[PDB]
Subunit: 259 residues, 3 copies
């Protein structure tokens, strides 16, 4: 999808690409290591067994959708390794996972929402998946559009995220009462991350260089690195611990849900 | 995937991009509104089984039953993006109008999947990939500036001709199964399918990439009408067919003619 | 994704694109015909019935995942028809399935591994699918990267293929003892292809023009055409025959597996 490249003399001074590339690459490398390790731990813990007691699976293998958290974290860590390669190369490399904003997100966060929908048995999994997909593609279109019509694309995205976020939240409530207080605690701390950090991205768009111009692209990269540390890694760890508590309640102890 | 852009002085006069962009954008906006509303109604009606609105035993509809509305909403979102591109004068970096049939590789394969799920047609993956490859051959034909585009088109015609001849046969095998009311809705949906899907190959021949009889602006308008029919009207007919089938088999508990 | 094009005067003499394009196109056309015919035979044989006796399916149709071998072969044959179109056009065609190396592979070989995982009932099908996906995307990134960081991307790919290949192989062993000696023979000859030809691609990268410079891009295209003839077509035929033998053992004769 690439047409631009770093000029032979380097990025023009004062442009949005005139960033601290060693620092951005180091941040991306640290994020890659942390998120990939979190995904590896997620998959290893999933293969250990059900619940905190590590009860062996009857079929000998975990459910395939249960690997989504670790798979998404490992994919995000691989993309962050690629991002570190791009930043350490000075940016603007042909395979830049940093250039097109939210393009990487169209790969992780839809699946992430799918993982969420699978962990909480939320209805309309395909609907949520496609809502997230279209919101992220509207964001990509907004960030590649140089005219004012980018604010149209952003608005289009806000027309897909506002219902979805209001729908998911409602459904999450319907599931929250079902789970026991320990699984409820883990679910609460994960939903805090979800419904307090997913809205940040739309707000970050407004104050970015494509909006009011308060946040530079370098600061945007750092902020989104921290958000991916929270939205992928910490959220996936909270999902894994919630699943372990649920399996301990319902599979190891055989107790029923509050449904 | 984009390399071209609208020249600073505008599109060259007499080129295929020298179109009526306010008109194309208005048509795309109207199509966006209609298709998105049709998908919203499809999902709302799905969440309401059958005309009696019998509650689901699990409390939620089957996930594949949302495909019609999901596809219509995705097509409406793409038409909103198309209206943004046309109102910007075309050649916008995120142009869903530039690469022809590129948007279709997202909607119509899933659409065929939806069809295969509604009629319990065999070889759903086969049909999905046949549609996928036909549409990608069309994209390759439209981006190819040499005569080898007619090769790509031919390649697409090598994937659509069997598929359309296979699906039709399978549709016959399913048509006798359903009751006369579901048969009526299925007949009117299959009329749209087997009379409008062949139009695209014929439209290629007479387009600016063929004999040069249909301009790109007329192509955009014709395909907007086709997407109004192939996505929205077809999805409404599928939703009504599913409602009639659910009324026959779930609300009344009657068996199919199988 | 394309920015480059064949110069009006033709490819510069001595460049990596200064290849024998009629020969490459003829090879691609022959590969297209063979792989597409192999996929057509795979689907026809699958529709014939279960096993060598062609026992009719109880539901009247084959399992949908059983069509993966033929579907992948037909998709690869279609991409080879497109490759022949590109080569006969002189290369550098806007829709070039030859330009970006391993970009076509991100479509076939992940699904292929999925097919394998479905035929052998291997655990962690999503994990294997995403491992292959990320390995191939790392290869694409390495081949589009003009700096030394391509060897980073390659290394990243080697960080995803080395565990996966070591994991799959282990799981394959766990399945190998399950199947009868005839299915074991077909599985052995397919695993020979897998574990002796998949490692070739990483080795071919090192000696390619992007590495030590021993293998030209034309030779690379010919070698990968032969590999796709083996890794898609011959491997799919071996999978089809293994499935027929398994169906004859377990469905036609009703005999149990050695599990
Ligand atoms: C509404 C909206 C947006 C939404 C972004 C979201 C919801 C991003 C989530 C990212 C995550 C969860 C990343 C984790 O790895 C954009 C693209 C800013 C702009 C267009 C409209
Ligand atoms: C055979 C063939 C074609 C087929 C097109 C079809 C079958 C399109 C269907 C579109 C739909 C149903 C859109 C709805 O939103 C092309 C691409 C014209 C050209 C190459 C060969
Ligand atoms: C490890 C590695 C690679 C692996 C390639 C493989 C494993 C390719 C398989 C291809 C097949 C099976 C094709 C069949 O149609 C690359 C991309 C060379 C380079 C980066 C790292
Ligand atoms: K799960
Ligand atoms: K996991
Ligand atoms: K990332
Ligand atoms: K990018
Ligand atoms: K980015
Ligand atoms: K950028
Ligand atoms: K995760
Ligand atoms: K997660
Ligand atoms: K359905
Ligand atoms: K629907
Ligand atoms: K559209
Ligand atoms: K397009
Ligand atoms: K178009
Ligand atoms: K165009
Ligand atoms: K539809
Ligand atoms: K439909
Ligand atoms: K199979
Ligand atoms: K097959
Ligand atoms: K190929
Ligand atoms: K390519
Ligand atoms: K290639
Ligand atoms: K090339
Ligand atoms: K195959
Ligand atoms: K195969």
């Amino acid at each position: 999808p690439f047409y631009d490249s770093r000029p032979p003399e380097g990025w023009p001074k004062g442009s949005i690409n005139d960033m601290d590339y060693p620092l951005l690459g180091s941040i991306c490398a640290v994020c890659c290591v942390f998120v990939a390790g979190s995904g590896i731990w997620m998959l290893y813990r999933l293969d250990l067994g059900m619940g905190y007691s590590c009860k062996p699976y009857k079929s000998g293998r975990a459910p395939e959708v249960n690997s989504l958290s670790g798979i998404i974290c490992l994919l995000c860590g691989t993309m962050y390794a690629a991002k570190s390669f791009d930043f350490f190369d000075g940016g603007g490399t042909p395979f830049s996972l940093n250039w097109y904003w939210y393009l990487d997100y169209v790969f992780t966060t839809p699946l992430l929402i799918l993982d969420f929908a699978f962990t909480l048995d939320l209805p309309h999994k395909i609907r949520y998946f496609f809502a997230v997909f279209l919101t992220l593609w509207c964001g990509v279109a907004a960030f590649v559009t140089p005219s004012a019509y980018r604010f149209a694309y952003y608005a289009l995205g806000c027309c897909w995220f506002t219902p979805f976020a209001l729908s998911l939240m409602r459904h999450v409530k319907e599931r929250y009462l079902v789970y026991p207080p320990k699984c409820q605690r883990w679910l609460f701390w994960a939903c805090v991350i979800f419904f307090g950090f997913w809205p940040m991205f739309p707000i970050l768009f407004i104050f970015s260089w494509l909006g009011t111009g308060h946040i530079s692209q370098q600061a945007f990269y750092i902020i989104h690195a921290f958000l991916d540390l929270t939205c992928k890694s910490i959220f996936g760890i909270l999902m894994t611990v919630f699943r372990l508590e649920l399996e301990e309640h319902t599979e190891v102890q055989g107790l029923p849900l509050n449904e």
